[PDB]
Ligand binder design. Structure first.
Ligand SMILES: CCCCCCCCCCCCCCCC(=O)O
Ligand SMILES: CCCCCCCCCC
Ligand SMILES: CCCCCCCC
Lengths: 385, 385
């Protein structure tokens, strides 16, 4: 309660905005209209204000658009069917009751496909409006008054939500994508040092969050293409996809840290005395990789270009010293006695596995650097100077 | 869409069952009332039918219980406020708007907590019913005549939905969990064979499905506890929690196949001439591991116990043969002229990493066999005669 409120004040502003929007969609009902029935059709505005008010502006825009489309398509369909029913007499309330089964079946079948998982609420509003329009106006024949009334109540319930969301302390999805891209670099940098220290002593979230967030970055990128230009992002087509490309480049490197963490938790291990012969080189490689990842995160946070100097020189030299040391003491990994216990040999080879994995991690960084250069060039970052 | 219908005929009966329930509600409203009231309040039965129909019986029962608690908790609070607002005479219209503001704020703050994210469907029902029962009876005082005429249409909708869902082709979540476990056992074996075949040439779906579904198993287990005993699952408390343990053991075994697939896509690779020296042992270990996994999958599907003979003897012999072979040719993996280029040394050292990862995969199977024995004992599996 109070702890979460103090930690993040964005959710108290969100809750107060929802309260304000409801209090307005209620004062308008009380005073702006004295009609008796006006107060029974209040559910078509409250459902709208409870289904379209979202955390970000782009999600609210998308949901509003979808709801409008659904309602209009099903009001047109309902009107057309109600007209066409009269053609054959005596078949009334039977040819209207045989179309609800076919519309509900087509709607559900179309709603269960995997591609259409971002329109789940416009199919429900389509079915609800079709059935309501057909059933309500059957006895009296008045279908257009019901259609128009309900549509106006939905635009009256969606425009106050959009105004309140956009004008009182807006939250943007593009800035959330920018901050998640910044955060992943630090999580991976912490994970690598955690793994190396854990293996050399006498993590999970760091690589999991980067390896388990592609969907979040694709939804945040689907909401960011709806928002108008604002703040630091002034072009009319911001390259929001190069952020996803850089995030994927970083996930490809985080899979090796996941494999090193799995190397720490194995059934077959090596004697500590043997591992303490390579401590210096491994600690150097870990320090250099953490420095590089933190420098790339800092340069992405400030929207700056890369300098003239090469950033991978020191990590490359550290990995070359590691290779030289491994070449100088290779007699502690293989059994030289036999040359033409299984546990002892597996314990010996688990150290060569750990070293090979660290070298592969150091070899996968150039792709991340290239993706960063491409993003810094398409997004017009400023000169480091 | 026709193809999706032929691949899963389970999706063509759900749509026809929803259509049939909607048609039954339509007929009851059309023929069992001579007054428009049941036609004018007919949006509540349609909304209930579209909201409360789920793929499984246990999800329908649990979500219906949680949706029937929010409506009965939001219907008494609105009548207590509408009865306590009389005291504040004259200024009795501001106390009814400050309560919509307070309830809105509180319900959104509670819904934003990170442990309540799974119950976002009960807070919407609570907020909608409170706001409707407070904005609908304001100008007349008929607060108890608006909460009793709208609850029988929701009882009609819930009853029709429950009868049609439970009595026409019921779908059970325990069978879904059983089939998921069998499918994961098959997929891991196919991925294991694919990895070795791809490495020795002159995968994603399996481990990616068996490592990214724990949430699905937890949801299916949460739904299967509400269902009554049926078919082969005849017991008051079926041990549905012993399936998740076996799934977790299989996920721990599949992280090594994911590390071997990552070994295939590495930037540093070993020469083919040195790879072909160890072809026989790797092929044998792959054949044995795939046969063992498929045998355990067939034993799980048929609900049968393990026999007298040991199931791990041949894979345990193959691993020892591979170890002996590696011991006899270890001079091909290291440089023995420096004992006291980097790319060549790393390429030589990658083969030992592939071999060590296969040995670790072979070492992780005892835990899965123990989990299977525990499940076969707690669930009263039958003798494998
Ligand atoms: C999501 C917006 C609110 C939707 C309101 C319609 C759902 C009605 C509340 C659920 C009740 C269904 C459970 C059985 C109810 C009963 O036994 O009376
Ligand atoms: C204590 C009685 C609960 C009243 C809830 C009735 C729900 C009415 C739906 C608008
Ligand atoms: C678009 C045809 C007129 C009816 C639309 C009503 C929307 C509910």
């Amino acid at each position: 309660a109070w702890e979460m409120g103090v930690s993040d004040p964005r959710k108290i502003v969100f809750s107060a905005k929802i309260g304000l929007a409801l209090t307005i969609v209620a004062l308008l009902i009380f005073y702006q209209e004295p009609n008796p029935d006006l107060s029974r059709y209040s559910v078509w505005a409250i459902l709208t204000v409870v289904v379209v008010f979202e955390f970000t502006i782009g999600a609210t825009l998308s949901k509003g658009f979808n709801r409008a489309l659904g309602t209009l398509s099903a009001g047109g369909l309902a009107l057309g069917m109600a007209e066409l029913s009269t053609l054959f007499g005596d078949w009334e309330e039977i040819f209207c009751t045989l179309s609800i089964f076919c519309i509900g079946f087509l709607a559900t079948f179309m709603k269960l496909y995997p591609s259409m998982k971002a329109y789940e609420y416009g199919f429900r509003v389509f079915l609800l409006t079709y059935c309501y329009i057909l059933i309500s106006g059957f006895r009296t024949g008045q279908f257009i008054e019901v259609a128009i009334s309900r549509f106006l109540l939905i635009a009256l319930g969606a425009g106050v939500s959009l105004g309140v969301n956009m004008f009182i302390y807006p939250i943007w999805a593009g800035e959330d994508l920018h901050n998640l891209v910044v955060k992943n670099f630090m999580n991976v940098a912490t994970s690598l040092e955690g793994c190396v220290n854990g293996y050399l002593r006498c993590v999970y979230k760091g690589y999991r969050s980067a390896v388990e967030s592609t969907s979040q970055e694709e939804s945040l990128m689907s909401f960011a293409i709806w928002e108008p230009p604002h703040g630091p992002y002034k072009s009319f087509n911001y390259p929001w996809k190069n952020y996803v490309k850089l995030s994927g480049a970083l996930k490809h490197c985080a899979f090796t840290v996941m494999a090193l963490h799995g190397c720490i938790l194995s059934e077959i291990q090596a004697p500590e005395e043997r591992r303490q012969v390579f401590r210096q080189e491994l600690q150097r490689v870990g320090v250099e990789g953490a420095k590089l990842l933190r420098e790339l995160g800092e340069k992405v946070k400030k929207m700056e270009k890369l300098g003239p100097v090469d950033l991978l020189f020191e990590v490359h030299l550290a990995a070359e010293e590691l290779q030289h040391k491994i070449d100088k003491k290779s007699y502690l990994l293989v059994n030289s006695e036999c040359w033409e216990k299984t546990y002892e040999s597996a314990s010996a080879l688990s150290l060569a596995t750990f070293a090979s994995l660290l070298i592969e991690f150091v070899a996968r960084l150039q792709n991340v650097v290239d993706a960063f250069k491409e993003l810094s060039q398409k997004a017009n970052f400023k000169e480091p100077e």
